[PDB]
Design a protein around this ligand. Structure first.
Ligand SMILES: *CCC(=O)Nc1cc(Nc2cc(N3OCC[C@@H]3c3cc(F)cc(F)c3)ncn2)c(OC)cc1N1CCC(N2CCN(C3CC3)CC2)CC1
Length: 295
């Protein structure tokens, strides 16, 4: 058939990593910040840890969550968060690199204004480039949003939380799964209605994600009850044009949110189309005051 990936997963002891501060948490697995010292010594490095806090339904899913994270370690992308290691306690614990500046939503909302015309355009290039790697490794992400994009540096974003991921094999160009536990707002009507997931279902999320960035961390369909996205989408409504966006940029968001996922854009085009706009940010984004400078 194909080729051995042989991407490896390290195993570590509950005593190689302690737990500092409680970052995110809730419903599913909770997550902490901490330091980690590898076997022996050398140097000490910061890290984030996910422990489930037991259940065959619970343990079976967190397994596949970490499985995918290493199966795509291959060469590995700088816009795709790599799996550091894993420790097997009662409560299984997952270890990744720590991203010091949080996530794009909690970062964009903080500097709602005062973000650069380039920075916004670069992130589109970045998020798209990473998703191309995921698309190339036959992986869909389903849960792509600004909440699930982290910032290593103000000019470096990555994708994470493969919690709902699923690896599409040879042939089968779609997938079906749990009839629930889904983010409806960032979801495509092809999926909301038929529980089918193509690579083009993630294209839909990309549009919503960039929309979040351009709207400076605003909530898609605020107040619109989740029960109605099926109707409001089929009726025609979509997220309105962000203020700073030109017809050129919003046209991309609209092309992604088309019903026919087949006429939706491919990720490769998104890199090129957005890489071009990065070369002239002031012509494609109308930011109230440029001149980036210091803080
Ligand atoms: C968008 C929300 C968020 O995640 N903020 C955030 C992010 C980091 N950096 C970070 C995150 C992660 N990942 O979380 C899940 C996926 C990934 C991950 C994957 C794993 F396999 C394991 C794992 F542990 C994590 N990975 C690495 N790095 C971060 O680290 C500094 C902190 C935060 N926080 C922002 C502030 C926020 N908090 C502040 C106060 N405020 C409340 C009023 C009380 C809002 C919440 C807490 C999260």
């Amino acid at each position: 058939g194909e080729a051995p990936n042989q991407a490896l997963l390290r195993i570590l002891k509950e005593t190689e990593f302690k737990k500092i501060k409680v970052l995110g948490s809730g419903a599913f697995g909770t997550v902490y910040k901490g330091l980690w010292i590898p076997e022996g010594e050398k140097v000490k490095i910061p890290v984030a840890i996910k422990e489930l806090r037991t259940s065959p339904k619970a343990n079976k899913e967190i397994l596949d969550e970490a499985y995918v994270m290493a199966s795509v370690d291959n060469p590995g992308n700088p816009h795709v968060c790599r799996l550091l290691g894993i420790c097997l306690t009662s409560t299984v614990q997952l270890i990744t690199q720590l991203m010091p500046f949080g996530c794009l939503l909690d970062y964009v909302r903080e500097h709602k204004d005062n973000i650069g015309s380039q920075y916004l355009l670069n992130w589109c290039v970045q998020i798209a480039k990473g998703m191309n790697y995921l698309e190339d490794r036959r992986l869909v992400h389903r849960d792509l949003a600004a909440r699930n994009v982290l910032v290593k540096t103000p000019q470096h974003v990555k994708i994470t939380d493969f919690g709902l991921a699923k690896l599409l094999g040879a042939e089968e160009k779609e997938y079906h799964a749990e009839g629930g536990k889904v983010p409806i707002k960032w979801m495509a009507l092809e999926s909301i209605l038929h529980r089918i997931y193509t690579h083009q279902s993630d294209v839909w999320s990309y549009g919503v994600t960039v929309w979040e960035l351009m709207t400076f961390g605003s909530k898609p369909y605020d107040g619109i009850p989740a029960s109605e996205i099926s109707s409001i989408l089929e009726k025609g409504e979509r997220l309105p044009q962000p203020p700073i966006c030109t017809i050129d940029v919003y046209m991309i968001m609209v092309k992604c949110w088309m019903i026919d996922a087949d006429s939706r854009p491919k990720f490769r085009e998104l890199i090129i189309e957005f890489s071009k706009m990065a070369r002239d940010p002031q012509r494609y984004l109308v930011i109230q005051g440029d001149e980036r400078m210091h803080l």
